[PDB]
Amino acid sequence: VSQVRQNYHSDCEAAVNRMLNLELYASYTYSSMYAFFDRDDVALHNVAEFFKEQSHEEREHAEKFMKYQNKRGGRVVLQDIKKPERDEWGNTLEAMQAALQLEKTVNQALLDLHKLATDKVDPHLCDFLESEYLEEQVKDIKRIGDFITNLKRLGLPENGMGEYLFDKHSV
């Protein structure tokens, strides 16, 4: 037993490791979206950079879980980072729709972890999730939803002019 460990359930420790992996998975998916929008036959640079930024943010989320694990006396256990679900992302609307679903998947995992922490009476873990993850998730989901509404308004997927306009005025 780690000398620092106090009120940290084995189940929570394991769930933190799984959450870390999911953050890394999300990062990798966003990196794929970056590379797609940087393709010469796609060429939406501001969209690409948005997803690149998101990729870096997700990596930061993962690293914060690593630090958390050690602070509580848990042990970081890593697993493979699975490649993204797709190799190409269609267009800005399709990519944003996938990003929304990804963000909701990550959010659900965070909420499930919060429920576990609650069940195990771990207020430190609850506080950590609330203060460092849950509000950022809601903000990101709202931003992506707002983008999707605008992409639909702009006539995506069919309206190429609309897609250009979004890249030039929304990101």
Which of 154, 135, 33, 14 lies closest to 89 in space, CA to CA? 33
Min dist CB 152 to Fe ion, Å, is 20
Please state, in angstroms and rounded to a whole number, the distance separating the CA atoms of residues 106 and 43.
Answer: 28
Q: List binders of Mg ion among 128-167 (CB under 5 A).
A: 135
- Looking only at residues 122 through 151 of this chain, which bind Cl ion when binding is defined by CB under 5 A? 150
- Whether the CB-CB separation of 21 and 79 falls below 8 Å is answered with yes
Q: Least separation, in Å, of the C-beta of 80 and a second copy?
A: 5
Cα gap 94→99, rounded to integer Å: 9
Residue with smaller CB distance to Mg ion, 60 or 169: 60
* Contacts to Mg ion from residues 22-41, by CB under 5 A: 22
CA-closest candidate to residue 145, choices 109, 101, 89, 107? 101
Question: Residue 87 gets which letter from DSSP?
Answer: S
The residue from 31, 55, 61, 163 that contacts Fe ion (CB under 5 A) is 61
Q: Which of residues 112-141 bind a second copy (CB under 8 A)?
A: 114-115, 118, 121, 123-124, 126-131, 134-135, 138-139, 141
Give residues in contact with Cl ion (CB under 5 A): 5, 8, 88, 150, 170
